Amino acid sequence: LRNDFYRQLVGKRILIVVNYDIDAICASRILQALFKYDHMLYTVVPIMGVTGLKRAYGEHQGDVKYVVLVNCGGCVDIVELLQPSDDVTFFICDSHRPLDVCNIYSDRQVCILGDASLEENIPAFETIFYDSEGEDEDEDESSDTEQQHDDSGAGESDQEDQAPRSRKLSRLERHEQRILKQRARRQWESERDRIMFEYTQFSYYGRSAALMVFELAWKLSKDNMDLLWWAIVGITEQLLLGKIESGAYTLELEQIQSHVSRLTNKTNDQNTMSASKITFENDLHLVLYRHWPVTESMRYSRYSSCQLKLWTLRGEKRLHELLLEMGLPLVHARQTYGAMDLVLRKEFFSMVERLAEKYDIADIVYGTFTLSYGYRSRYAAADYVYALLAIMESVKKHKTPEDCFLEASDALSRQHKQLLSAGIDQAKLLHAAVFRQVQSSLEARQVHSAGSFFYYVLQEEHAFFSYPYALGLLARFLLRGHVATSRARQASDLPLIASCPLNASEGMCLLVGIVPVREDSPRNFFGKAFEQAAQKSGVALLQDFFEPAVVQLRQSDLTRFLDSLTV
């Protein structure tokens, strides 16, 4: 709730919107709007990393009490992170959910939006910080330390039969005067079975970043159509239930339509140009039905391709055979779908949905929205987001990271669109440059298993694959690629790694972790899994991202680290 706490929000603030994300911008531009509405000046921020965050707060060494960060938080007992915080108001709203408890407790400078059907970690603080063994926060028999310290009367207090609290059992000795430590460790470790179940085996994401924010601003009587679209963007990023889960899809078909359909501000007069209120339809995650012909865009998506195996010829043969049953002309299969004639381009999906039921594909259609600004053309559900990811354009000017962020947030207006087509173009060329490596690497047989996983390494830098989003995308097209056709049915289920050269950064051999096949809810080990070898030998590793599934190494200090990381 903040139908009460929002009424705190008038004084000065800082609105930080942590490292690059589509949840980020969609969730934050609305609040920029909200906050120049009630006549507040504030601060939006680019985040380059947790160090970027810490210097940022360092540069804002004031007493801005209404500090705000969003889509982060699980890093420390962040009073340890952020010492000078005294009673300063922070707000966490992150869906990176497996977060510390010291950030949850200490009801001082934090917002426990603790609301979940998992009441599983209640004494998770009641024994690690509250108990201790072989400790110094205590007294001694001598008269020089005759003062009572922060006596928790627990293992946090002494273990020499000095514990006024801890009134479950005997006092002097259970079997010995220090069986205190024995039972302390019993509970400690027997329930580190569940502490190590947290944060040291697996990570995930939770819920939205900004649909809660839509309901917040909905209670103040705003029917901002565009805010529905921006939140739609925020979700349709990791609506990708194979990437990171939505789940609620068939429940949000009630939720969001109920937000928007039932309140019909015009039921009879809406046949107008500007922003004719949003609609909903059941369509695909075929990449880019609209502005391209079929036959290139039927070819660069993984799911349409992997099930029909087109990077070899034979897939094209069966492809043509299904265009045959579809009876699309090849010319028409090479003019833009919109550039087609009428009747075919109307009936296209109408036929494809039902007579693809019978030929190896079942999971291409979705439920989404689309709308006009005017009479130019009818933009698409995600063709923003696949234009966005192409704006992470790590050029060597050193300004372009933050500048491309600022550009991106200045994109989803109804105004700036000469760039949006730019994003489309950039996206397409990268999208088929993805495919351009798979044939090279598959049929060169670069699929290094090397034991319990599959593994890739690469050799030099591409501007595609300088940054790691494209890298995860590489790994997540090859994987299906190889494991369709080179295997029996036994070994299709193992995880994957991939090197990522950075000729820019003096030689670091970046990596990204990614998971085996077809287990949507059973997600990453790699919330910590890499860190094993970090303990065993341990060499210059990083975990800088609030994204977990990533590292950054030296050019060449990986292989032995990998041999340790065999297990």
Place this chain on the structure above:
Amino acid sequence: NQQDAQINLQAVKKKYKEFIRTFNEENFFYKYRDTLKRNYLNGRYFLEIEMEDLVGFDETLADKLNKQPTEHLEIFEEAAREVADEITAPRPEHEEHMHDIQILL
């Protein structure tokens, strides 16, 4: 004039005639009226057009425009001169005489 379909009149009657008066976005640029008039001023006697505005307007003309363009693209001319000669009037007194024009695609 067999007013059932493919008629000489329906297009010119209002449709093409009003497409441009109707062609609108705020910023109040987004017509072909301004371009037309300011072209006329300098003896041009033409204007530039797209072919995917009909999708901005409708779903019928284009798959009829491709079929018998030879006629449609002169109905365009007639509609053009009648929709522009009203503006040739500053009042009825300075159309010394009308004139013929060429469309583009």
